[PDB]
Amino acid sequence: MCAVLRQPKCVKLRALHSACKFGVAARSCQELLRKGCVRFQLPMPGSRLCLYEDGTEVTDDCFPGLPNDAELLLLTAGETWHGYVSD
Amino acid sequence: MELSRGASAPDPDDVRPLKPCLLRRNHSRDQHGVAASSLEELRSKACELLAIDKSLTPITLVLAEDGTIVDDDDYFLCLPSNTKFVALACNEKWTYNDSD
């Protein structure tokens, strides 16, 4: 199944201790998941991501649910992102 | 080219209509207007304009405004025909420096 999208999605791959991120887009939520795991070395199964807005776990099934440039933070199966706290 | 091409037939007109980005090399407050559609086109221009030797690659294009690394070619063509692209040939100072 190759669902044809209307426009290339957009997201920002930000790491936790990298002090930087990887802005990249694509017409396939899955395609982005790979490039991110290739530049950050983070497999989908043994490694996922979490919205940097509220620490929302994101993967290849809940990534497209986010708008364009989705703050995708790096999160392996072991650490969790507290979430943009205001304390 | 007179063939009516505004949406029908492949080779659309909005296929990266040249993106005149402004490349800048750290240690030198000098921006350069470079018309490039796909990243490959921009990168090269930044190499001949900033002299990014191939020994400094992989180069890192981080936006001077935000600093997001642009190591792709599907999200850096959205900005208007003009953006501050800080070229970092694995040497130029980064646009972050713990500046959170």
Curated annotation (Swiss-Prot), chain A:
Superkingdom in the source lineage: Eukaryota
- Start and end residues of each CIDE-N domain: 7-83
Give the subcellular location: Cytoplasm; Nucleus
- Protein function: Nuclease that induces DNA fragmentation and chromatin condensation during apoptosis. Degrades naked DNA and induces apoptotic morphology.
Self-association or partners: how does it assemble?
Answer: Heterodimer of DFFA and DFFB. Interacts with H1-1.
Which protein are we looking at? DNA fragmentation factor subunit beta
From Swiss-Prot, chain B:
Grouped into one coarse class, the protein's main location is cytoplasm
Q: GO molecular function terms here?
A: deoxyribonuclease inhibitor activity; protein domain specific binding; protein folding chaperone
- The CIDE-N domain covers 17-96
Q: How is it modified after translation?
A: Caspase-3 cleaves DFF45 at 2 sites to generate an active factor.
Q: Which UniProt keywords apply?
A: Acetylation, Apoptosis, Cytoplasm, Phosphoprotein
Gene Ontology cellular-component annotations = chromatin; cytosol; nucleus; plasma membrane; protein-containing complex
The protein's location, in the record's own words, is:
Cytoplasm
In the record, biological process GO terms are: apoptotic DNA fragmentation; chaperone-mediated protein folding; negative regulation of apoptotic DNA fragmentation; negative regulation of execution phase of apoptosis; positive regulation of apoptotic process; thymocyte apoptotic process
Modification sites for N-acetylmethionine: 1
Function per UniProt: Inhibitor of the caspase-activated DNase (DFF40).
Q: Partners and quaternary state?
A: Heterodimer of DFFA and DFFB.
Protein's recorded name: DNA fragmentation factor subunit alpha
Full-sequence portion shown in this chain: 1 to 100 of 331
